[PDB]
Structure formats: C-alpha cells, structure tokens
Amino acid sequence: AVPFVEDWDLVQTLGEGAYGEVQLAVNRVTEEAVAVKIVDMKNIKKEICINKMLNHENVVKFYGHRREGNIQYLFLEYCSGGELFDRIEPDIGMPEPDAQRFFHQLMAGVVYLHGIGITHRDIKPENLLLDERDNLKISDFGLATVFRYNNRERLLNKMCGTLPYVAPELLKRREFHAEPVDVWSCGIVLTAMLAGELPWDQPSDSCQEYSDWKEKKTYLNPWKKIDSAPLALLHKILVENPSARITIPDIKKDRWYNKPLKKGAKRPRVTS
Ligand SMILES: O=c1[nH]c2ccc(-c3cn[nH]c3)cc2cc1-c1cc2cc(CN3CCCCC3)ccc2[nH]1
C-alpha cells in the first residue's frame, strides 16, 4: 500500500553526544518530520522499554525502533523549537510569563511520568524540547527508571543526573525517594529560566553558593534577579530535606504558579 512511504531521508544533525547523534528525518512521500536517535551499539534496551509506555503531550513521543545489525535507530518526535536551553539568555533568563508557561508544562509532563511510576532523573534545559507552538516536551529517557511497580515504591540508590541539577540527598544519602529528586531538578530549571544562571556547581555544603542559599542570602546574584512570588516558590522547592520539600500537587497550589501572567498566542486581531 503506497510505495516508498517507508523511506526516510536524514536531512540534518539536530545534536550529538556521548552515545549517538540525533538527526532530522523527513519522509520521502509525506514529508513528515521525525527525529532519529542513532546509537552505535558497539541502557538502550531499557530506554526503548520506557519510551514505549509513554504517551503525553508534554513528553517526546516514541514511534518505534529499528535494530538492523548493531546501529540502533530510535524514531522519536521532532520538536522544531529545539532545546529550552537555547531559550535561556545567559545571566538574564527569559520573560517571567514564558517561564511560568514552560514550568506549567514541565509540571504536567512530570506529573504524568510520576503517575505511571517513571522518574526521568536528568531533567535540565538540554532535555526539554519545544515544538512549533513552543509546547515543552520532556526527552531523553536514557537515565530514566521505574520507581513504582504494582503500586509499590522502590527507593533509588544509583547516582544519576547532572550535578548542578541533582538534589542534595543524592549526594549525601544511600537511598532516596525518586519524586523529590525530579522536583528539585525542576526547581533548578525554573531558576535558570528566571535568572539565566545556575545557582551552584552542586548542592553540597562545601559549595559556597549553596551554603548562602541555605542561609537565606537572596540578595546575592542568582536570587536577587528573581521576583518575590516565584522566589517564594523556589524557597519551597529547593529545600534540602526531601521529606519537607514541596510536592507537585502543592506546587500546583502555589501563589506564583497560579498567578495570571501570560496571554494567549495572539491568534486573532483586526480592529474596526
Ligand atoms: O526534535 C528533536 N527531537 C529529539 C527527540 C529525542 C532526543 C533524544 C536525545 N537522547 N535521547 C533522545 C533529541 C531530540 C532533539 C531534537 C531537536 C534538537 C534541535 C536543535 C535545533 C537547533 N538547530 C539544529 C540544526 C542545526 C542548527 C541548530 C532545532 C530543532 C531541534 N530539535
């Protein structure tokens, strides 16, 4: 049925890394675009497994995979907007309304993942992609894992993530709950979106920037650029004790989270 519809052309490189490269693939017939993650197999098995059980508007869709010898081909959703990382201006951030909208969407995606027992473990601007309408989608489940199965939660112990975004308990406790960790990384992402900089190299007492935060020195560079409303949310998210840290349902009740700020997407306009 309909010849050539199976053929995809690798038009360009969307990004590379330490395992594979991601390229934009365009269908020969329909011209539909998708992102193909090429992993030179010479982790990936679990990534595919996790991706197959993902279906949400704020999570990069997985279409399928092609073994073909050793080179593994993962067909994923193409997000023309690129990485949220590139939408963050160094030392500045982005307009608060935009950050709020992206944060809302990030929360939606994380609620979904946690809802099906999956923790991402490496949430950062480089892994949050944007589609044509700037809708945020969580990507790269290479470090993800199931933390809840048969309604039984499994505590984590593996060191995973990226230091500036990792929660403090991952560095000082043998075991820890999965959810507060993703929540913390989302808080670091929010900070980056509102200030254009990361607060610390890592959440450890030996890190001066981290000690200052614990001491409420918000008059210092990072926090001084953030308005009081979102800063109060950050004070609830970036809490060292994961058991006292705000949970997502409570984040959804936060004053800034619910503050009207962002208008629609300027759809219509014809005065007179
Ligand atoms: O759409 C994407 N889907 C996707 C799905 C899964 C993973 C993924 C990574 N590991 N596991 C899964 C990674 C990606 C990355 C994507 C992407 C990057 C990018 C960069 C630019 C900037 N330009 C790129 C072209 C050169 C000029 C700059 C424009 C659009 C754009 N879209």
Nearest CA to ligand 1 atom 30: 82
Using CB atoms within 10 A of its CB, is residue 70 exposed (0-12), middle (13-18) or buried (19+)? exposed
- Known catalytic residues are 122
Inter-CA distances, 147 with 23, 115, 144, 176, 207, Å: 31, 10, 9, 11, 30
> What is the 162 CA–ligand 1 centroid distance (Å)?
19
Q: b/e string for 209-226 if b means 16 or more Cβ within 10 A?
A: bbebbeeeebeeebbeeb
Identity of residue 268: P
For the domain bounded by 1-89, which CATH number is listed? 3.30.200.20
Q: Per-residue DSSP letters for 183-236?
A: HHHHHHHHHHHHHSS-S-SSSSTTSHHHHHHHTT-TTSHHHHTS-HHHHHHHHH
Question: 153: Cβ–Cβ under 8 A, 6 or more apart, which residues?
Answer: 147, 177, 178
Record the tokens describing residue 19, joined without a space: 């395992």
CA pair distance 217, 226, nearest whole angstrom: 13
- 3-state class of 8 per DSSP? strand
Question: Are 1-89 and 90-272 the same fold in CATH?
Answer: no
CA pair distance 134, 100, nearest whole angstrom: 13
Please provide the distance, in angstroms rounded to a whole number, between the alpha carbons at the two ends of the chain.
Answer: 52
> What is the 165 CA–ligand 1 centroid distance (Å)?
21
Using CB atoms within 10 A of its CB, is residue 166 exposed (0-12), middle (13-18) or buried (19+)? buried
User: Where exactly are the structural domains of the chain?
Assistant: 1-89, 90-272
Q: Closest by alpha carbon to 198, among 223, 231, 181, 172?
A: 223
Interrupted after residues, the chain (C–N over 2.5 Å): 42
Experimental determination approach used? X-ray
Is 142 a known ligand-binding residue?
no
Four-way CATH pick for 90-272: 1.10.600.10, 1.10.510.10, 2.40.50.100, 1.10.150.530: 1.10.510.10
Nearest CA to ligand 1 atom 10: 140
Q: Closest by alpha carbon to 123, among 189, 172, 211?
A: 189
Nearest CA to ligand 1 atom 22: 82
CA pair distance 35, 21, nearest whole angstrom: 10
- Resolution of this PDB entry, in A? 1.7
**Vertex 135 angle, CA 56 and 181, to 5°:** 65
Question: 28: Cβ–Cβ under 8 A, 6 or more apart, which residues?
Answer: 4, 5, 7, 8, 9
In contact, 125 and 208? CB cutoff 8 Å: no
